[PDB]
Design a protein around this ligand. Sequence first.
Ligand SMILES: CCCCOC(=O)N1CCN(C(=O)[C@H](CP(=O)(O)O)NC(=O)c2cc(N3CC[C@H](OC)C3)nc(-c3ccccc3)n2)CC1
Ligand SMILES: CC(C)CCC[C@@H](C)[C@H]1CC[C@H]2[C@@H]3CC=C4C[C@@H](O)CC[C@]4(C)[C@H]3CC[C@]12C
Length: 363
Amino acid sequence: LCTRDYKITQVLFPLLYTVLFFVGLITNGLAMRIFFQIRSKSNFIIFLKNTVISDLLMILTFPFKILSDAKLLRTFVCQVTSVIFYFTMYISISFLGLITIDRYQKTTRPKNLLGAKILSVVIWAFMFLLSLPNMILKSEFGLVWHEIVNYICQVIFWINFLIVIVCYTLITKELYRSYVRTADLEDNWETLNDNLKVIEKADNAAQVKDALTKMRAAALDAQKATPPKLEDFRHGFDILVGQIDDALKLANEGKVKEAQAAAEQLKTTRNAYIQKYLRGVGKVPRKKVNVKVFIIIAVFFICFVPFHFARIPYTLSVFDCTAENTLFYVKESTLWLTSLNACLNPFIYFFLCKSFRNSLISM
Ligand SMILES: CCCCOC(=O)N1CCN(C(=O)[C@H](CP(=O)(O)O)NC(=O)c2cc(N3CC[C@H](OC)C3)nc(-c3ccccc3)n2)CC1
Ligand SMILES: CC(C)CCC[C@@H](C)[C@H]1CC[C@H]2[C@@H]3CC=C4C[C@@H](O)CC[C@]4(C)[C@H]3CC[C@]12C
């Protein structure tokens, strides 16, 4: 009824999948060799470990899709392996949500290794006995069971998608907050030093009065942003603000030359000592690695987001062959992106697991 370019149907796609199959077998190959030469000492390494599996279960369905699509009984093994694939994909999606959570929790931190394995087994089993009826199969109980599983699967995606949205939203708000705090504090000090130069090269009392005002404000801002350390990180600020206040008085009284020299006293060795110490106390770096953590949301968005997003228009809202062909391609390519996950998961192991990257540095 409807015809498409076999250059794309029987060639491009089978090759695209062939790429994925190899690229995916090698990376997940040496991955599994690394992962069972690492003791499972946390939630994370454990969820990662399950990912290696569901990835190899994914790769091992590619050939049957490759040979079928390139036109090489022959049709029932297609229904089974595709079930195994769909099983595989929603497992990947489930663990990715857990990995998200697990990673999000370690970014709100300066009983497990046993419940983690159990939750894993729940994941698999609940997918398996949801994948069983589809490959168990006239009897029209099953083609309404398709609307059952298809429904479950939408919920599985959307819940884990929400998880991802929330966790990365909380991680983004925190990393932003952390950035602005440090950016401002650096600003504070930079203003202090900048308005001293202004003072140094100033004529009137108005120039001195203004720069000192900015300095006073910046200093007090710095002090606010720098609570004392639990171990003279409060008395120091009193000295610096003191000098600034003194210089301000001199500048208000009219004596600009004295003002400038009172200002200059921040350049004494002791005052600069104090400054360097107060600058020191201020910087306390402890933020989650940027392009390292976001890899997950990335992989999730590349692989799983499109297949589900693209469905909602033309699942919730035609005879012509271009529209039915547009749909074929959209579905088929999004499903390719889905499969790409088995190749993008090794990246998560690399960019986020210390021990993994070590074996990978070696073997
Ligand atoms: C726990 C795991 C258990 C194992 O899982 C399974 O066994 N699953 C059964 C198959 N299932 C699907 O998700 C099926 C795949 P298939 O149809 O069987 O190949 N997709 C659809 O049923 C479907 C329908 C649809 N429409 C409904 C009419 C409308 O006509 C206008 C089109 N559109 C799209 C769509 C997709 C991507 C992009 C654009 C559109 N998909 C996944 C879960
Ligand atoms: C389908 C409708 C009713 C919305 C339901 C969404 C549920 C399933 C999602 C949305 C936001 C999610 C939460 C987002 C963040 C956290 C904090 C983390 O420390 C543990 C998981 C937890 C608590 C998630 C659990 C699942 C959650 C509550």
